[PDB]
Design a protein around this ligand. Structure first.
Ligand SMILES: N#Cc1cnn2c(Nc3ccccc3)nc(NCC3CCCCC3)nc12
Length: 327
């Protein structure tokens, strides 16, 4: 039996109007208020375009959704509404649908994002600390509002580098946290899935996002994208085990009484823990200080209960300069 160490009762104390997302009645806007300017992306969930509001001439992002169940879309909409105005939380501007096809589109604020594959390599030590701190504000906020993002990855972190503006987007996989609830482990992107998802521990919590953040962070400071490069869910756990070591995995499994599938146990084998500095090289030297390693080490723990919470992470000395500058 596992439960979050912080914000566990947020949804217990709030009324049904907050977490009963299926009760939501979607208020449709007008499709004609928005026009496509250029396609900027695509995914299994939607096609994304840079758009413009013909009324105010303001830029926006239009995501034309592929077939989705009523329950799922209501969940994304309710969460976006509940988190409105929070630090670095993307703003949902409107929700529209095509009459004949009933194809819905979500309208979001526009962020002039630069491909992370091109942006990250140019980030300085300070830039990394700054952007990760900004992302942490968003995570502590949603966690404080009883919501788990469950899909933290570079693709869901829009950054306008010129303006130094960051937004955590795509809340379609997010969920409300309820103590003891068993969630679907089929969330997050493989390279960012926490050990809990990989060993089928269903009663996970906000801490899942912290493992994903840790993966992003490790990728940035070590200049290795992605950090844990597995080809399937089983191999993903193997990649993690070859770094953190099987001793910690065994302890983790014993604590929560989890039994790995025979095939998985075989693939994992036995591995010694590898010091974080073994990933240091001439290319990532100006970015792997002791503070960075200490911070990373406290994020990437098998036991989700051991990981730093977003609030704790924000106070780690690694971010002391960012905090000082802000104050
Ligand atoms: N909500 C929201 C949201 C807000 N901006 N935004 C952007 N901005 C953007 C602007 C110009 C060029 C590229 C992107 N792209 C995507 N999704 C598309 C990206 C997904 C990650 C890989 C690159 C394309 N989603 C969003």
């Amino acid at each position: 039996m596992s439960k979050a160490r912080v914000y566990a009762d947020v949804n217990v104390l709030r009324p049904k109007e907050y977490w009963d997302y299926e009760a939501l009645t979607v208020q449709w806007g007008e499709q004609d208020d928005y026009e496509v300017v250029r396609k900027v992306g695509r995914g299994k969930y939607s096609e994304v375009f840079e758009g413009i509001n013909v009324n105010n001439n303001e830029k926006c992002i239009i995501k034309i959704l592929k077939p989705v169940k009523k329950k799922k879309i209501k969940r994304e909409i309710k969460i976006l509404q509940n988190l409105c105005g929070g630090p670095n939380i993307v703003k949902l501007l409107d929700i529209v649908r095509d009459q004949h096809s009933k194809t819905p589109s979500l309208i979001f604020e526009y962020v002039n994002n630069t491909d992370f594959k091109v942006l990250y390599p140019t980030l300085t030590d300070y830039d990394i600390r700054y952007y990760i701190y900004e992302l942490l504000k968003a995570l502590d906020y949603c966690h404080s509002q009883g919501i788990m993002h469950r899909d933290v990855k570079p693709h869901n972190v829009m950054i306008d580098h010129e303006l130094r503006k960051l937004r955590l987007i795509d809340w379609g996989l997010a969920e409300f946290y309820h103590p003891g609830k068993e969630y679907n482990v089929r969330v997050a992107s493989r390279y960012f899935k926490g050990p809990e998802l990989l060993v089928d521990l269903q009663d996970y919590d906000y801490s899942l996002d912290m493992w994903s953040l840790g993966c992003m962070f490790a990728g940035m400071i070590f200049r290795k994208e992605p950090f844990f490069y597995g080809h399937d869910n089983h191999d993903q756990l193997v990649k993690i085990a070859k770094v953190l070591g099987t001793d910690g995995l065994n302890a983790y499994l014993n604590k929560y009484r989890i039994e790995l599938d025979p095939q998985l146990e075989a693939l994992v084998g036995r591995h010694s823990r590898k010091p974080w500095l073994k990933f240091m090289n001439a290319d990532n030297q100006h970015l792997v200080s002791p503070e960075a390693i200490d911070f990373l080490d406290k994020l990437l723990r098998y036991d989700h209960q051991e990981r730093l919470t977003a609030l704790e992470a924000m106070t780690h000395p690694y971010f002391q300069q960012v905090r000082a500058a802000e104050n």
